Amino acid sequence: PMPEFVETPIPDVNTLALEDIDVSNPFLYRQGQWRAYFKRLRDEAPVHYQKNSPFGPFWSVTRFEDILFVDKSHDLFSAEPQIILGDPPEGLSVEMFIAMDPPKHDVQRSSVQGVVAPKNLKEMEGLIRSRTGDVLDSLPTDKPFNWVPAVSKELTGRMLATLLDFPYEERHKLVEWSDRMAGAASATGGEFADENAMFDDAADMARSFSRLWRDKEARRAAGEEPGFDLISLLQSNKETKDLINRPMEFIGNLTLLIVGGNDTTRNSMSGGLVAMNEFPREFEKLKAKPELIPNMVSEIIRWQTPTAYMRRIAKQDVELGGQTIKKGDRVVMWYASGNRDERKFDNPDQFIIDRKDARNHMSFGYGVHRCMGNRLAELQLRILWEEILKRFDNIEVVEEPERVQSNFGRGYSRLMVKLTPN
Numbered sequence: 001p002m003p004e005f006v007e008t009p010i011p012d013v014n015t016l017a018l019e020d021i022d023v024s025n026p027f028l029y030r031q032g033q034w035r036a037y038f039k040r041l042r043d044e045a046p047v048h049y050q051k052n053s054p055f056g057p058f059w060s061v062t063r064f065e066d067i068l069f070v071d072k073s074h075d076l077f078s079a080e081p082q083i084i085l086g087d088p089p090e091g092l093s094v095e096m097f098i099a100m101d102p103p104k105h106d107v108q109r110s111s112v113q114g115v116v117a118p119k120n121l122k123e124m125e126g127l128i129r130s131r132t133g134d135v136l137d138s139l140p141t142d143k144p145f146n147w148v149p150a151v152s153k154e155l156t157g158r159m160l161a162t163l164l165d166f167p168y169e170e171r172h173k174l175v176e177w178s179d180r181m182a183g184a185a186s187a188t189g190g191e192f193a194d195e196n197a198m199f200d201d202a203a204d205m206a207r208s209f210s211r212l213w214r215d216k217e218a219r220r221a222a223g224e225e226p227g228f229d230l231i232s233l234l235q236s237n238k239e240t241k242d243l244i245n246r247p248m249e250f251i252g253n254l255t256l257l258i259v260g261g262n263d264t265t266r267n268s269m270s271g272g273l274v275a276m277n278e279f280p281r282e283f284e285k286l287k288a289k290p291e292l293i294p295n296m297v298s299e300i301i302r303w304q305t306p307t308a309y310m311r312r313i314a315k316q317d318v319e320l321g322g323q324t325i326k327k328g329d330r331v332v333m334w335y336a337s338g339n340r341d342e343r344k345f346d347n348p349d350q351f352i353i354d355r356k357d358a359r360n361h362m363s364f365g366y367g368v369h370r371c372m373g374n375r376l377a378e379l380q381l382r383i384l385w386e387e388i389l390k391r392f393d394n395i396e397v398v399e400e401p402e403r404v405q406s407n408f409g410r411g412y413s414r415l416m417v418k419l420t421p422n
């Protein structure tokens with residue numbers, strides 16, 4: 001059983017020899033050391049091998065251009081068998097096409113991609129906007145409140161339910177299951193170290209998803225209008241009508257969807273407020289020119305980088321950054337560093353809503369695995385800020401945010417916000 005990660009003070013990077021820089025530490029983000037640690041790696045060892053880590057030996061690729069190459073080169077770097085830095089609880093490795101190489105990756109992704117196709121998103125836009133306005137209206141305006149459960153987690157759970165047509169009153173289950181899987185100490189240095197609960201969740205999820213498939217099939221056989229959820233789409237296409245007969249594909253694809261959209265959406269929604277707090281001239285610029293919302297959504301996603309990395313394994317020896325990556329080595333593409341690389345972005349650490357190249361961010365990765373839900377993610381953020389401008393003249397963070405323990409998700413568990421209506 002992987003032991004629990006206990007927080008200790010992270011020293012300055014200059015106190016360390018290059019070979020001893022270990023960025024797998026899941027408290028780097030919380031302690032505000034990630035920026036300096038990744039800068040030193042970009043400047044002095046952009047392709048860096050760490051031989052001593054709790055998750056095992058690994059390479060760190062930290063420059064924007066080098067990450068691009070690795071992410072795009074599925075001929076040289078495999079996404080199998082996992083894309084988190086460590087390993088899952090033995091027996092609890094779920095099959096997900098995010099950790100699959102072409103050509104199977106392509107078959108499975110194509111079988112679900114229609115759920116976030118633009119025509120499908122347009123039909124979801126009104127429900128997303130309704131819920132966003134209802135949630136914002138319900139918020140207190142005379143006192144600070146925790147934005148994380150009140151807004152980010154609330155809207156994300158509703159969205160995950162809509163994607164699977166999951167019972168709304170059980171939506172919390174999708175988040176709880178996703179949080180435990182992504183926060184496994186063995187995989188991300190997260191706080192979830194009870195493996196029995198992970199096995200319990202796996203069975204509860206297989207049963208819940210199986211019940212959902214059979215329930216939707218029955219309702220379909222009864223002539224219910226086919227919805228815009230993944231289940232309805234899967235049951236509407238010849239190749240996936242029998243998907244329940246293949247349980248690895250079924251449970252894997254559905255688990256990937258909810259984990260993929262769980263804390264990414266949550267921390268995108270919270271992170272924009274943190275960026276507004278650090279660069280409040282950005283809020284005045286936005287109020288003066290709302291047209292900049294779409295570009296600002298890209299800049300929020302660049303600055304926050306809700307998912308810090310994706311991991312690969314070298315299919316062969318590969319020369320990169322003056323180093324020889326050996327076949328079988330684990331290679332970690334640090335999006336969180338790539339997006340702060342001044343070789344691509346001027347003033348990278350600065351939140352600039354009118355940033356000309358904000359759309360060039362690598363927060364969704366690049367290559368065959370580039371985030372499938374990227375348009376829905378941008379849609380949710382665009383609606384949130386449209387509805388924020390309608391209601392509030394100012395939003396202030398009145399307390400230092402509390403940040404989540406993980407080397408994988410970059411996020412906030414507590415964000416105290418004071419709203420000023422207009």
Ligand code: HEM
Nearest residue numbers: 097098260261264306310364365366369370371372373377
């Ligand atoms: C800003 C929000 C989001 C972030 C930061 C994010 C992050 C990522 C990243 C980094 C990847 C892999 C990139 C790569 O390896 O090159 C990915 C893939 C994926 N994401 Fe997201 N994502 C977001 C939104 C969403 C949402 C809302 C969903 C669900 C609706 C989703 C579902 C997926 C799926 C299914 C994949 C696998 C695609 C594949 O492997 O072919 N994403 N995401």
Ligand SMILES: CCCCCCCCCCCC(=O)O
Nearest residue numbers: 088181182184187259260307
């Ligand atoms: C414990 C092994 C599984 C870890 C969680 C699944 C992998 C992450 C999938 C979501 C990707 C993302 O959110 O960017």
